[PDB]
Symmetry: C2
Subunit: 46 residues, 2 copies
């Protein structure tokens, strides 16, 4: 999986923002993104 860095986190959060403009049109993608954001946040501080 991708290296954890604040830059990556920022991309993930920005891409997540954009998709919320289309309610539940990319439901699977949203779960993946949320999972990966959570994973990267934890990695950043450990």
């Amino acid at each position: 999986s991708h290296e954890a860095t604040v830059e990556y986190l920022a991309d993930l959060v920005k891409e997540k923002k954009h998709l919320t403009l289309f309610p539940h049109m990319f439901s699977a993608v949203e779960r993946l993104l949320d999972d990966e954001i959570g994973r990267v946040r934890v990695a950043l501080f450990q």
Copy 2:
């Protein structure tokens, strides 16, 4: 990690197709989606063929 089934794989593939409407706009997501598709294909394959590991 989501359960591996045919319907899920199907949803993944449809979502990937939709994302092509947005070239170069969601590339972090493209990598994640391709990873999850691969993982799911492998999971369905390992379930048909339990004695094969990849």
